[PDB]
RNA sequence: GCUUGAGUCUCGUAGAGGGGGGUAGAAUUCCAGGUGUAGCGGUGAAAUGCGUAGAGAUCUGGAGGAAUACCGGUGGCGAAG
RNA sequence: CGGCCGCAAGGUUAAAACUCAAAUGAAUUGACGGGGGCCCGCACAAGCGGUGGAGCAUGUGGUUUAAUUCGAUGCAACGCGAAGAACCUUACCUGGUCUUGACAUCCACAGAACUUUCCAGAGAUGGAUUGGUGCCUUCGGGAACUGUGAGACAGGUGCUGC
RNA sequence: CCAGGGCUACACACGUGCUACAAUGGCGCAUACAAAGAGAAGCGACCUCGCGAGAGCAAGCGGACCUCAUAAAGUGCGUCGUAGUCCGGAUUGGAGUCUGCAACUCGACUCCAUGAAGUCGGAAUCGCUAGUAAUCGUGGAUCAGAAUGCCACGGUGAAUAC
RNA sequence: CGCGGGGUGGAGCAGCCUGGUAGCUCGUCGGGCUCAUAACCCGAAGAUCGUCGGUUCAAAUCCGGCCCCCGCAACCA
RNA sequence: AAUAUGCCAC
């Protein structure tokens, strides 16, 4: 809401962050753009076509490469979504490999940070 | 297979009686290709079973079979919603092949030394149906009473 | 699927080997690259001859280069004086004396290698290849081959989904090792990338 | 004017065509009783349900309602239902 | 919605605004069926022996780290590329260094190469230097091998197997 | 380009294997029977030394000749007598051999010692119908060293299929 | 305000009335079947009982308050 | 006897 209501996947309180590094390694300006795609999930009005709640509560972000192929898969932690990992795929439909990994690091974030977000966050 | 097998493998007789039903319980007791191992062990089982009781070894060991060899087992059939346990009566063969894998099971689970001292043991309380052999073919029959009603098929 | 190599499947029975030089453990490394080398040197520096086959030959510290060609007036020149430079560069890279003979190849129109090399040059020069491979096998069933097979595979005339089309005429058996089939591969390096060719000509049986 | 359309009369024909009234046998159910015991009934299995207060089964006698086995037939009749 | 009919359920007559570029019928080729018929395969059934449990080896995912290089990841990835990571390999990381370059051609100049030895530096690399100063020869120059000097380029296990 | 490090990290999870859980066995002593392959800064006899890995001198052989290289399971005798055990070998301490400039991260092997978990493994799941499965050893490629993997070779050798 | 209760794993409930110890279902986690998910199958962990202070050798239990949540009552003029 | 589902341009 306040512009920033994000927050990134570490795997412990001080867990090199296991998403900053997986973001800093997509090529190029695609990190920004994915950040302004944040922003606009923050804005409410990202395009269509964009995001897609894979299986669980996982959604993917997507960008470009072929067809909005520059993924992130996150989860929405009450008001504030928590961004898993970042990655690039080739094929549509993110792998399941990278899916499942994704649903690992939500488990590993909700034994960590916690289950249910803050009361007032 | 859903064409037909040719005729069975010969087997070669054994060579201290030349009964190739005991070459078969040789085959049969036999673990890891150890044949040398699984005729001593038969042998010296069948020389102890002989000396206790007074029986030849062959007919002795025929009648120890013979108290343990099954008439009619159970076999699966779909219907729907259950199983049928139709009973079905055994061809001889199967029939002997059956009360020498029952006698070695009960034989390898019994709990003695030497396997052939297994052996002897449990082929002479087959002698009297008291094995674990005899109970497996008592409740092959039983079951088979029971499902007595889908004979028919 | 993927096929066995027609040639490869029946180098020891009705087919020969573009080799026959016996070294042992210590020469055969050796002898390979300098093999390699001599038909790389004489592939590039005689691509316009149109060589069609390069047998080498090692007797005794020796080497004997037999190039069946389709134009021998072309790769021998005025009385000897190209192949007497081929001769000196081939013996230099070889490290010992060489001996060049040229062969005699009736029909280039019957030769897998050649009808190869001809279709990727016209593919370099956009030509239509449907209309090559065509021509091609049209070429081969009037010389008289009893079969051939031509594959043109890749960015086919300028498309950005590379396919792969193939004509056919008479009987190409590849399952048959007795069947002489003379099978041989070329690549053309087109300014939209490379486009493979591949010729299978069944010339008979025995 | 005419009769070949249309219609009437004379003789017969086949039909679950319609409306009204009566009746027949088979069967299910119920009621009364007799014999007669622990099961019955049901399902793919099961349970709910019925039964030792005596069911189910079987026999006798009633009551009442509904539908008409066989004939029975891409058979018949009807404008259709 | 309004008329008419109805006791009501509702029937009958009967639009419009908007919205799409189709909806549809019959046949055709496949595919599919918890449709049928006929078959086959260690597919089941009949047997034997395993795995899943234990310790170890190995690969993978995940965490970790500066790096834990990259690839394969339904069957048809996971003792897979890799027929064999101490340095090398090695592509990654930390630092020390070089930029026509380690490797190629071509330009010019210098110098035979080659061998040995001393210093410093983790080594790279830089200082030197003992010996060497030739092989053909239009004997003057070229052939080699080395350094230097600008490049045209070289280099890329960087991306894209959609 | 260079030296160090990493690819060998470990709360965990999965795949594929190896060794086991024992008496159809373990250990000790004697002994029989193979195929196939490799080899020249290579295979390395014999002999001497070492408890052993191995060391010294060193023939022979690019080989149907020599070496690798005594096959093991099997057979004969003894022992152990059902016990977490003379099973089982992980882990760890000390001492060492070889390769390689170099074995700390991170090698293999040997000796002494330590001797773990494991008593046949839930749901589930795999291979196999013949000399196959099962079981026992041998060789090779890669390779300075570094196989339980991979690729081959033989020995013993079944049950079952209505 | 008086009176009767209640506070128990992440949710719903037992246990407590007879002080010697906390269970059930769903859920969560791990594996399995599935191409994948749901269902399903097999294993595991999880609350130290609202809270303070007493009693007692021992308190979820007994007691006294305190906190919050329900229910009844808060009337006659 | 039970046997639900499959949204990422092509
Ligand atoms: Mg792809
Ligand atoms: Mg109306
Ligand atoms: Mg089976
Ligand atoms: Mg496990
Ligand atoms: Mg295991
Ligand atoms: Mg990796
Ligand atoms: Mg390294
Ligand atoms: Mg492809
Ligand atoms: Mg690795
Ligand atoms: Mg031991
Ligand atoms: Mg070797
Ligand atoms: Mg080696
Ligand atoms: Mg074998």
């Known amino acids: 809401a306040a512009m920033g209501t994000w927050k990134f996947f570490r795997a412990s ?3 090199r962050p296991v998403f900053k590094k997986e973001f800093d390694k997509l090529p190029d300006q695609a990190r920004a753009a994915l950040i302004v795609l944040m922003q606009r999930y923050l804005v409410g009005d990202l395009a269509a076509g964009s995001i897609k709640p894979i299986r669980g509560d996982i959604l993917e972000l997507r960008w470009h490469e072929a067809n909005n192929h520059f993924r992130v898969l996150f989860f929405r932690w009450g008001q504030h979504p928590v961004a898993l990992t970042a990655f690039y795929a080739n094929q549509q439909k993110t792998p399941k490999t990278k899916i499942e990994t994704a649903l690992d690091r939500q488990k590993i974030w909700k034994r960590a940070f916690g289950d249910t977000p803050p009361i007032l966050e | 297979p859903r064409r037909r ?6 087997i070669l007789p054994d060579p201290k009686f030349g009964s190739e039903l005991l070459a078969k319980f040789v085959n049969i007791l036999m673990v890891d290709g150890k044949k040398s191992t699984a005729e001593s062990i038969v042998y010296s089982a069948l020389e102890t079973l002989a000396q206790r009781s007074g029986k030849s070894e062959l007919e002795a060991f025929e009648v120890a079979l013979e108290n343990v060899r099954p008439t009619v087992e159970v076999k699966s059939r779909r219907v729907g919603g259950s199983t049928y346990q139709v009973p079905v009566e055994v061809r001889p063969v199967r029939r002997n092949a059956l009360a020498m894998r029952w006698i070695v099971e009960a034989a390898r689970k019994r709990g003695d030394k030497s396997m052939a001292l297994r052996l002897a043991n449990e082929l002479s309380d087959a002698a009297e149906n008291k094995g674990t052999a005899v109970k ?8 088979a009473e029971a499902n007595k009603a889908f004979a028919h098929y | 699927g993927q096929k066995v190599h027609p040639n490869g499947i029946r180098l020891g029975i009705v087919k020969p080997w573009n080799s026959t030089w016996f070294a042992n453990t210590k020469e055969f490394a050796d002898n390979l690259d300098s093999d390699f080398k001599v038909r790389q040197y004489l592939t590039k520096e005689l691509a316009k001859a149109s060589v069609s086959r390069i047998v080498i030959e090692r007797p005794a510290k020796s080497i004997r280069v037999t190039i069946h ?5 072309i790769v021998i020149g005025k009385k000897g004086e190209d192949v007497e430079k081929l001769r000196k560069v081939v013996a230099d890279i070889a490290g010992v004396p060489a001996q060049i003979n040229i062969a005699e190849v009736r029909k280039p129109e019957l030769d897998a290698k050649l009808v190869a090399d001809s279709i990727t040059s016209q593919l370099e020069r956009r ?9 091609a096998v049209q070429n081969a069933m009037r010389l008289g081959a009893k079969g051939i097979k031509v594959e043109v595979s890749g960015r086919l005339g300028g498309a950005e989904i590379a396919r792969t089309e193939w004509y056919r005429e008479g009987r190409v058996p590849l399952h048959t090792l007795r069947a002489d089939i003379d099978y041989n591969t070329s690549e053309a390096h087109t300014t939209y990338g490379v486009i493979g060719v591949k010729v299978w000509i069944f010339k008979g049986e025995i």
Do not use: C, L, S, Y
């Open chain 3, 127 to 135: 030509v239509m290849f449907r209309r090559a491979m065509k021509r």
């Open chain 2, 136 to 143: 497996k073919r008592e409740d092959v029959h039983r079951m």
């Open chain 1, 13 to 15: 309180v001080d867990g």
């Open chain 2, 5 to 10: 097998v040719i005729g069975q493998r010969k």
């Open chain 3, 69 to 73: 060609t389709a134009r021998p007036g």
